[PDB]
Amino acid sequence: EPCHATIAELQAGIASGAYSREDVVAAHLGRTERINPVTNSYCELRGDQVLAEARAADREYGRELSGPLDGVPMSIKDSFAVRGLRRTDGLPVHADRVADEDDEVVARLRDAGGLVLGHANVPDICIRWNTISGLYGIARNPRDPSRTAGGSSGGDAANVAAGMATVGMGQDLGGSIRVPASFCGVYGLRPGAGTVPNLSVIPPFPASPTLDAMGTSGPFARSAADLRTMFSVIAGAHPHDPVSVPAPLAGTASPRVAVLRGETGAVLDAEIEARLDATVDALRRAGFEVAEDVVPDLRRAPEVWAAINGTELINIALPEVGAEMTGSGRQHIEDMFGIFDLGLDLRAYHAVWLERRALQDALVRFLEDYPIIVAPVAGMPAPPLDFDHLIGREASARLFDRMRCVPWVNLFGLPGLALPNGIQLVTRRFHEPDLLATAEAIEPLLPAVEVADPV
């Protein structure tokens, strides 16, 4: 069916009169009546409204294809404002926070053919690795509903995984896109800093300089060419976003490759060690000069990130948001990031911030000779829903130890492409195409993605 079809695929059907947009959405909406009570991936769905857009587009254009995403149903995170939906951020206090405007990224997609089905579920403050929300509920991995969907953007990945949407939209401050990706088996792109505009009406978090360097907005999809498509739509610099850069995207024709096992001090299972090792061969098969043992030690990088973020979460964020937050996540943050809390003294914040530049200054010189880095995302296969429910410290720390390959990409404002095998690809800033290109080469060689069935 369409729900299991690529963007171009479902587009060709519309073209050939096979299926109308009205069909494509409605089919998706019906599947969502069936599957979503299980996954809990969508929180607010605009079925009546979206169907109107399906009809009208079907009317005016018909077999005509409007934009690259004409007739493409999409899953939009709660964090990206959509008109007629709510920027709840998972909090009961913000239930009637109706959105009057669409963030530029959203507007960008709808301009190319939106068919935005509904708002995907997120954690309480979008700062968790499990999509557990006080308001909506708990996202359940369609693969194994006992397991976790993902961190922040998990709802989106659930909607893409469970065929309830062709593509989805997420953000990656702290692996908040690449992690949920690996867990749902979907494709996930965190764009680099400067490629995608972030212009939020009602915004999650403030516009700290940390999310300006470490946080980005990215797509979810079940094909590499789906990903490339959604990227090309949202990509582009906007004057109103100062973090947006008027810089052309780039690509190296001869990308030498490198693998990062333990340079971030992570504790990875032989499951994902094998998946990584698998991905490596595919590359060299596709004429990629992959190398090992050549990556400089970035053991501190996750920690630097942990400290910067953690410090602000505890000292600045929580003393307001802890009131309406889930005590699950409150205690998660306290337990997880409480170690690296640099305290209220700024001399320490400055200190850790300067080490970042130390590491980074090194990383950028490396990527000149090793532009692409294959590496483990989760370091853990999809954990249970209870993985972080009121777990103790040491326990909280041990998780961080495993998920230690996720954050370094955020810290250094690097583009991180998550393959469905739960391995990622990371490159130089503005070289985001290089990842999409190389991920098109491993798409054939590696296992193909299939829609999930909570049947």
Add this chain to the structure above:
Amino acid sequence: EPCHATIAELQAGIASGAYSREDVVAAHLGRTERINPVTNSYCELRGDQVLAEARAADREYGRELSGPLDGVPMSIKDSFAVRGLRRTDGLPVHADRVADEDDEVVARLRDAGGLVLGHANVPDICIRWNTISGLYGIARNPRDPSRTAGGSSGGDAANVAAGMATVGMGQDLGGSIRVPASFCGVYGLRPGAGTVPNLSVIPPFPASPTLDAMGTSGPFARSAADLRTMFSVIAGAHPHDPVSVPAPLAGTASPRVAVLRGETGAVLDAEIEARLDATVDALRRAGFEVAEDVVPDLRRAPEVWAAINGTELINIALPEVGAEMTGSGRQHIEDMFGIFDLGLDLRAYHAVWLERRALQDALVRFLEDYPIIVAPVAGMPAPPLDFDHLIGREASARLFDRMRCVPWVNLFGLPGLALPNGIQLVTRRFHEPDLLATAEAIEPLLPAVEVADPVL
């Protein structure tokens, strides 16, 4: 005469055979010997070295030109590592700290035929608007040695203004290129963020997010054309500079201009206001749309720049190298930046950065309608030498208010081109070109730039 000549006039006569690179280098080294006793603008001079470089390159390329800056003597701030020149930072402790390698920028310039005449004087921590070092002393204005040369890059500007260098190189965290240039009556360009890379062998400052966001390296010149030649060379991106962005330099067709006066809360001298009016008129005659009373309220902007930088300086930097710096310099920082000092509580430092973004958002939106802002730099002619000497907090606030059109360009990582009249054109990032274009267009209509000899 070489010392009074543009980069073009030099390259012409080198090719015509009427002068040589050696003759140029020697002419300058002569004048340096006369004027530099007064100005104290040059701290270290690699005479013999550069002289032989000209004879070498005189021999190799002869009447042909190596590239853009062939036969162009240059003044380079002490903050830029040049091979064999000390990186003093103004401090006597670093008097025998020599630089093994050229800085990226220095290489680029030298590669284009640039002959480094010598190092230029700087303030003690490169954090002052008056170039007074405990190692090399005070640098004086060639135009009036009674007045200040400016800070921090006040040596280079004085050098350029006094025909001791055709061009110069500086940095601009505060008004650290534009102010000296304005005071010394020369051109100066603060690039925006990303356009010019900083790869320092021995760093002037920590790679703070402050420096990343608010600090750039730029040229000094006597001609708008010579500015661009220098911006041309130094511009470009290096992968090893993370801040350096690989974006094409941009230009706008018939850009609108917005006159800014008090929208930052600045106290302007009538003269500097008169020059603003004169520049607005020349723009209008040069066929620009210039509007007044359009700029939003950016009065917190200079303030937020003072809080970020002031908190850091007082609490972080000064406790470190505070004992090795001039007492005048230490007190300045304490006097001026004391009121803005947010304290050690991180929660307040975070807040002001958030206020930056509120302001930045506003301005970036406005700059789409009015892409270029014409603004005063210092709002006062070069003050006397004692202008920042143990003045006290109250007086320090008053000076701050006079310099409130300088800090906002840095806070929003924007390019600023300082005309020799002390008037600045400011535009959006990566649009550095259309400041060079506007400054060239207005150049014939505004007063001319001439070299100054204090001794004669």
Add this chain to the structure above:
Amino acid sequence: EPCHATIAELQAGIASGAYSREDVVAAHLGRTERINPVTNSYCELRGDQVLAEARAADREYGRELSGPLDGVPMSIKDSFAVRGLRRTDGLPVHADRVADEDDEVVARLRDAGGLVLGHANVPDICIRWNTISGLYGIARNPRDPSRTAGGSSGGDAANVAAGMATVGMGQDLGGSIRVPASFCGVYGLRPGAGTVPNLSVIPPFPASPTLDAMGTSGPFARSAADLRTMFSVIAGAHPHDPVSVPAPLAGTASPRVAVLRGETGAVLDAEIEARLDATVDALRRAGFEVAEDVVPDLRRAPEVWAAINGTELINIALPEVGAEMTGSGRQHIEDMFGIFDLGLDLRAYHAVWLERRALQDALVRFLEDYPIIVAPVAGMPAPPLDFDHLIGREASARLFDRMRCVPWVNLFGLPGLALPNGIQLVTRRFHEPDLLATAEAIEPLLPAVEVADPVL
């Protein structure tokens, strides 16, 4: 030379037999001949007559001097009736309006031996800070004819500064003595209310209750003693002036000085503030106690003055004399005073007068603590001749802000002595003697007054 001499030196010369009174007059008229073509500071000259008068005196009194002001050539503002000289008010309409009788102040000065060289150029309604008349044209600063001579009494100031008169006489409703003196680099004393009588035969004003409060007549000079001598003659009360009070003049012992900077909202240039700092330091050296950050908040006082004067100019005066005044002058009033125009509703105007008494009752209380206020007159050195030429409302507002230290002295009926540096001393009513003494003390320690020749 007589033209550079003080009263004492002139009088001494006359007594010693070094020179005659006719010698002194003739010299001045000689200089006038050369310089007045440039300055345009004397509108009508009584040269033949004055020489007869000085000849006569030489006959009667010879080497014996029978006046404090005997042998002293004097410039007089057109606003003051001199017999046989026209009371034009700068207007062409009143060009043939001749005076039968001398005003009280004129008579007093003449009876003290003073010799009137001639009348001095004035603005059109005597209501401008630039001396531009439709009848007589513009008066230019002798020190730089590219610059304005000053407001209302710019002629008199210009004459005294160029040695075309030893002494001059003017009036001050705005800054109309102090502004000219500061601009022209001479001494000027605005007497407080009641000390000097106003008996005008052909009045330039209508004896508004405002002129009664805020307008006084006073001397120009090149020395503090010369200011003293002049004040001594004109001072004293007349029955026929109701605003005149029969009160003794007074002088406190070891008076205290408070420094006024931005307490009125003035936008001060860096040189004026520097000069302020100089006058403070001179005072402190001469044993005066000077305090800073002590003056109450008088920011509304300039604006209350503007409202009262502006409401009346625009709604009462300008309608009667609108077509006869220059357009430049008319538009200056409309542009600047248009902001503070309260319209014709009496209820508004009444209130603004009550706001005065509120501010006044604070100042009078503070003056008991700190009797003398040192403050800038104008925030700027003499502006260009075009400073008020059709500048528009926005620029006129900016200018008003620069001159916010001049109008408050008038609003409160207070004496103000303008030093040649453009720094003023202000005191309590009837304490003019304290100003004269304080000025004399700092006179040696501040730059000296010299006469000026634009021609040579």
Add this chain to the structure above:
Amino acid sequence: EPCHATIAELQAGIASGAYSREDVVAAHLGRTERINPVTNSYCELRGDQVLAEARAADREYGRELSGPLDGVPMSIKDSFAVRGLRRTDGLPVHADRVADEDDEVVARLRDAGGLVLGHANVPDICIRWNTISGLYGIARNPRDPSRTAGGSSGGDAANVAAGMATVGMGQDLGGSIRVPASFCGVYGLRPGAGTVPNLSVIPPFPASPTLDAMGTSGPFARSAADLRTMFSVIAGAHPHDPVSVPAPLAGTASPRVAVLRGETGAVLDAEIEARLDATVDALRRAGFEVAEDVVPDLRRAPEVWAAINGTELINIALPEVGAEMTGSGRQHIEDMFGIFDLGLDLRAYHAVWLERRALQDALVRFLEDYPIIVAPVAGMPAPPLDFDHLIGREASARLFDRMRCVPWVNLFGLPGLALPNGIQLVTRRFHEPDLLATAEAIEPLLPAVEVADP
């Protein structure tokens, strides 16, 4: 008999052991108990407080005299502030407005040994020629209580006339101390502009320029001698009053006198004109050059005064305090001052102010040739209490014209000494000593002042 005693008489008795300050105060206080129900002159009293003060002085100095006002009971108008005594202004709204401080005048008086017996009733904004307040009600003449004790400072006149106070203080914007004085048959001095400071803790009227120009504070007494004593204490400049001028008070050797009958356009009864004539003859008997038909035409003067004051009252004042005022007094102002109201055009208000200067310039010149002016105050003996009660415009115009002799003195900021006869002596500013001296010379010749007992 202290209640009928001059400052010097009771200064003798204290110092003779004849009485004590306490006796005098208690005496005055006692008499007050009886007479005050008739007069309704005193609104607030401070008997415990003042007696305490008298005792203290008795114990301190005893037969020694502290100051020129030691042992003198005094009535202070509500407009002036006494500590603890309330500043009602006749308005009930301010019935619980208590003063933490005394006004400088009161301070000076008290510091001279004076004993403030209490505050005196006043009209609703001190802007009426009959002393009727919303709080304390109507005030009645001690001589004939069918007739008013007019003016703003009507109580203080009553109190001094009635024996309930040796001395009193009032304020004169219109004839507001001279009129009472004349109606209640006692001396009343209106100082000229600059002589006596007006420093008010809670102000009666705005600090308007018109108050500065035409408003002064002055004493009531039954002796020309006690007037001088008073004025000598309250007189003198204060830095905190910008209107007070540090000018020495002046006197003339031989002053010429000019009689002002109808030059202000006044309508004068035969009684008042004969008193003028009597005063004129007394002056001549005292050796004064007195001249007639000399005074210039000051018929616009009373008119200009009403224009300025009136235009303000209606447009500025009344709208502010309208509802809290007695509808009698509200209407009085509208009735009388309505004709003179120039409206809200400043150009008109500006015009009459210029006119004042012209007139003023003329009078100041005249006052050189003829320093003193002898004139009527009211030109009507003490009217019935109903004179200003809803009488309407046309009738109010008639009243105005009778009093046309009183307001001009204020317009030109001139001193006016009202003799007990209802005749006044006006002179130049700062020449208040000349008035006091002429008064003292005429006192023997003209009729004597006796204390009234309703």
